[PDB]
């Protein structure tokens, strides 16, 4: 497996010893916040650090494209005819204290999220599609009517009844049903308002993974040891230590071999890591998309609808396309990214092989000839005097709300401005400077939307069900440029239709959607990205493969 020029796996030529201690770190300039219950945990650092303990007790294995498969802690099966998901927990699925994982532990997850007394921030609208769950969430019902137990609460089976089936239900991260268990017998006497701060969900939890946390140092570290009651393969290692390391100390920590693996390192540090002897640097395709938006209307919050009613030359398809073809994204990436940013051809990242294709063509290749010709034939005629184009007497001038974030954000933005000058479009920064992130978010997400920018950039970390509805639908508040297009609406609906229960049909729907978005050019895909992980040469069985389900049990050391 490759990801760009990176290997996804470190094929160590040396055999693993029996035992050993692996030293892992996560790069963060903020402390971790330990919370072992998925529904109550809001810290991405700790979520990753919980991996050896079961990742906050996730149930389901997937393939390398995040589609559910059988063989994890539980299986899930969908029945269209009865509008039901059936979750079957393994017979020997146990908590780390030896107690059984049961149907009730799965239901209890729902309670931690849906009962406001626990204080979860993880309720979503998608959960309202489970029969009876809204009524539980608002306190109208004492129980969740759509969740039943064919073999009772202490059995191993749970059935979840939906109002409507959704084709994304075969993808992990879909949000229509949950994928974790919580130890009800361990936590049942803790007041809901005290659950998040209880020792029992922080320093002294029960877990289901191959390792259990023997010691948690608040904000800093976990000492993991083998979980005797793990259903699967006994781990090779005797222990794993997982610690937070600061950005400023990560490179030195590799130089001194303080950590075997550091996760979450940022793109800027890669050139300092590449050259380190003693490490193999692995790479993987990210669940990420960056894109350019054009401002085309406003958002009507009361009626939950985008209205594409802004006066702007960007209402012209030829203009939107030309501004995309003018950019030099590849050249930019080649200068600055160290192969960690690669030009996007479409809005769905290539890691989703079942939902996209490299055959889809967008704006990944600069084509200034085409950009110029598009503007010509649309009546935007160039000037002798000024280097800029005019139509019905008015100059083609646009405002670019570029933002802070990338290490060369200023330089990249200026480069694009200069490319746009080459096609006779005058582009200026919003208020003559890059926008701060929090300012940018406010500007883009406060209805009805501003009228004082034309072009902006956004970037998203996508869930493993890469839903486009909450980003680009006519009803979506995150449709930042506010386009509203009958063909795109059709395309979006088709992706989530009953016909898309068929994977080949769904792939075709995702592909059409991506083609149509590129042609219409309301938005322009910019970059995909790669993540990297340095790995000490003594580590055996390390891989970034998303389909690798047993890495914590398989991983070892050669000395």
């Amino acid at each position: 497996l490759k990801a760009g020029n990176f290997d996804v796996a470190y094929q160590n030529p040396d055999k693993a010893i029996k035992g050993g201690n692996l030293k892992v770190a996560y790069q963060s300039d903020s402390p971790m916040k330990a919370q072992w219950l998925s529904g109550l945990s809001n810290d991405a650092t700790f979520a990753t650090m919980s991996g050896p303990g079961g990742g906050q007790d996730g149930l389901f294995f997937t393939d390398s494209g995040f589609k559910f498969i059988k063989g994890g802690a539980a299986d899930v099966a969908l029945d269209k005819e009865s509008k039901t998901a059936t979750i079957t927990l393994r017979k020997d699925l146990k908590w780390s204290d030896g107690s059984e994982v049961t149907a009730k532990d799965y239901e209890f997850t729902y309670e931690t999220i849906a009962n406001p007394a626990y204080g979860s921030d993880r309720w979503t609208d998608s959960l309202a599609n489970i029969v009876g769950l809204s009524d539980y969430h608002t306190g109208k019902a004492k129980t969740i009517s759509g969740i039943t137990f064919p073999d009772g609460e202490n059995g191993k089976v749970i059935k979840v009844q939906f109002k409507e089936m959704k084709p994304g239900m075969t993808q992990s991260g879909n949000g229509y049903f949950l994928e974790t268990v919580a130890p009800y017998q361990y936590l049942k006497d803790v007041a809901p308002k005290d659950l998040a701060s209880s020792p029992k969900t922080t320093t002294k939890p029960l877990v289901t993974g191959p390792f259990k946390p023997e010691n948690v140092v608040a904000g800093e570290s976990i000492k993991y040891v083998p979980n005797p009651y793990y259903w699967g393969e006994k781990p090779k290692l005797n222990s794993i230590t997982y610690e937070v390391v600061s950005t400023a100390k990560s490179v030195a920590a590799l130089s001194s071999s303080k950590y075997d693996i550091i996760n979450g390192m940022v793109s800027s540090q890669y050139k300092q890591v590449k050259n380190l002897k003693g490490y193999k640097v692995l790479g993987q395709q990210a669940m990420y998309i960056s894109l350019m938006y054009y401002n085309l209307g406003h958002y009507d919050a009361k009626n939950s609808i985008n209205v594409q009613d802004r006066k702007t030359p960007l209402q012209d398809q030829n203009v939107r396309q030309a501004i995309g073809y003018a950019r030099n994204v590849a050249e930019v990436d080649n200068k600055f990214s160290n192969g960690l940013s690669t030009p996007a051809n479409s809005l769905i990242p290539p890691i989703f092989k079942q939902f996209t294709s490299s055959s889809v063509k967008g704006y990944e290749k600069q084509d200034l000839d085409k950009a110029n010709k598009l503007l010509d034939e649309d009546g935007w005629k160039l000037n002798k005097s000024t280097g800029y184009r005019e139509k019905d007497g008015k100059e083609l001038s646009l405002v670019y709300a570029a933002r802070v974030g990338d290490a060369n954000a200023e330089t990249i933005a200026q480069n694009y401005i200069q490319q746009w000058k080459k096609i006779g479009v005058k582009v200026s920064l919003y208020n003559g400077k890059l926008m701060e992130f929090n300012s940018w978010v406010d500007h883009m997400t406060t209805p009805p939307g501003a009228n004082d920018w034309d072009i902006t950039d956004g970037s998203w970390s996508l869930a493993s069900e890469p839903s486009q509805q909450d980003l680009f639908s006519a009803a979506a508040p995150y449709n930042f440029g506010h386009f509203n297009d009958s063909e795109i609406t059709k395309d979006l609906n088709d992706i989530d239709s009953a016909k898309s229960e068929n994977p080949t049909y769904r792939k075709a729907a995702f592909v059409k959607y991506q083609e149509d978005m590129n042609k219409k050019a309301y938005v322009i895909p910019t970059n995909f990205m790669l993540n990297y992980t340095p790995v000490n040469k003594r580590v055996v069985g390390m891989t970034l493969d998303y389909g690798a389900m047993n890495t914590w049990s398989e991983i070892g050391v050669s000395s």
Binding site: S126, G173, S461, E465, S467, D470
Partner: peptide
Amino acid sequence: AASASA
């Protein structure tokens, strides 16, 4: 609610 700024 699935995807995040980042």
